[PDB]
Amino acid sequence: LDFLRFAVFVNGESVEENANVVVRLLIRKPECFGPALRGEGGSGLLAA
Amino acid sequence: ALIDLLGRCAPEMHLIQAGKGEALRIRAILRSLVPLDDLVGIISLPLQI
Amino acid sequence: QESISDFYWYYSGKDVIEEQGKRNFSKAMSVAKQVFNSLTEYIQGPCT
Amino acid sequence: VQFLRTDDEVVLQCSATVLKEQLKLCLAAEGFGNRLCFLEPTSNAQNVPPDLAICCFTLEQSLSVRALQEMLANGHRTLLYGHAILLRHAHSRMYLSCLTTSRSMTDKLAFDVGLQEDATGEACWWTMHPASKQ
Amino acid sequence: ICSCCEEGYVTGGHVLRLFHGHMDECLTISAADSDDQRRLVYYEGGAV
């Protein structure tokens, strides 16, 4: 996640193309969000 | 780290004001991804001293 | 063909093609010319 | 030997092996009173015949992704993979769209889909992707 | 749909009037206020 942060945020700005590609791949693979944000469990970030 | 990555993947304020479809779409995707109540709860989360 | 069509749908909203787009069109269209010449040399003659 | 094209009436079919039955269902919405879509089952027809007037969906228009973006910014065309299409309900005469309402209590992330009167937003467009690697 | 539907031909899925007689004799259901609870079928015809 830190590597992706350095990939998508450079020079105090948010790079549009990399941001869009990263969020696209993230929502293609929901398991990357962790157990809290999984659809079926619905654990909730605050509860986690 | 995940929430930070999403926050820095959020579109720029210039894009939001310009109203580009892809910018508003990614912003809405993040808005659905992360809820307001959990965020305000973790902001208000008590910390030991 | 699909890529050139997508390039057209991108530039059709634009009033005037920029020089970068003109160079890309010229390069892709020269490649297309080469492919068309390859096909014509395939079929030239009575190769049923 | 045949391919789906524009202006072809189509029913959206899905399969689910529930209780080892392999029930085949189809998308359907009343449109008036209940714009929300649902799955009515066409697997068991001999015992209970399924209605299809709420299940027919005409392919209004297929288009490429970039051309769709241009149209949003602003001929039996054969459908192909990677193209956004528009589905219009036969009875309801309103287009299938992804509603922002999320009634799913099992998954708060998931959104609902229903019928929208006007095809002005992008939520009414749906792009197919290649299911199998074949 | 098959799309083999012959033009000007009944194909199923089209609601229609049967017209049992020569004309103005279409088969309809029992009356709304009838004691039959709209169960029987009659070739009433006319304004129906």
Buried b (16+ CB within 10 A) or exposed e, D82-105: ebbbbbbbbbbebbbbbbeeeeee
DSSP string, D8-40: -EEE-EEEE-GGG--EEEEEE---SS--B-EEE
For β-strands E41-42 and D13-16, DSSP reports them as: unpaired
Inter-chain contact C12–D70, Cβ cutoff 8 Å? yes
Residue listed under structure tokens 């030991």: B48
Instruction: Pull the structure tokens for residue E28.
Output: 């309809």
Experimental method: cryo-EM
Chain C: nearest CA to D74, how far in angstroms? 9
Chain D positions in Cβ-Cβ contact with residue E1 (cut-off 8 Å): 8-11
CA distance linking residue D74 with residue D63, whole number of Å: 15
Whether residue C18 is annotated as binding a ligand: the answer is no
Best residue of C2, C3, C4, C9 to probe chain D, by most D CBs closer than 10 Å: C9
Of B9, B33, B41, the CB nearest to A19: B9
Partner residues linked to D99 by β-bridges: D112
Q: Strands, DSSP E only, in E1-48?
A: 28-29, 41-42
Beta-carbon count within 10 A of B49 CB: 3
Q: How far are the Cα atoms of C20, E14, E19, E41 from residue E26, in angstroms, in the given order?
A: 70, 16, 4, 10
Of B21, B25, B32, the CB nearest to D109: B32
D10 touches chain E (CB under 8 A): yes
Ramachandran quadrant class, E45 (left: phi over 0; alpha: psi -120 to 50; beta: rest): left
Q: How far are the Cα atoms of D31, D65, D83, D123 from residue D71, in angstroms, in the given order?
A: 26, 10, 14, 14
Cα–Cα–Cα angle for B9, D70, B10, nearest 5°?
Answer: 10
Residues contacting residue B1 through CB under 8 Å, at least 6 positions apart: A1, A2, A5
Resolution in A for the shown PDB structure? 3.3
Inter-chain contact B21–D69, Cβ cutoff 8 Å? yes
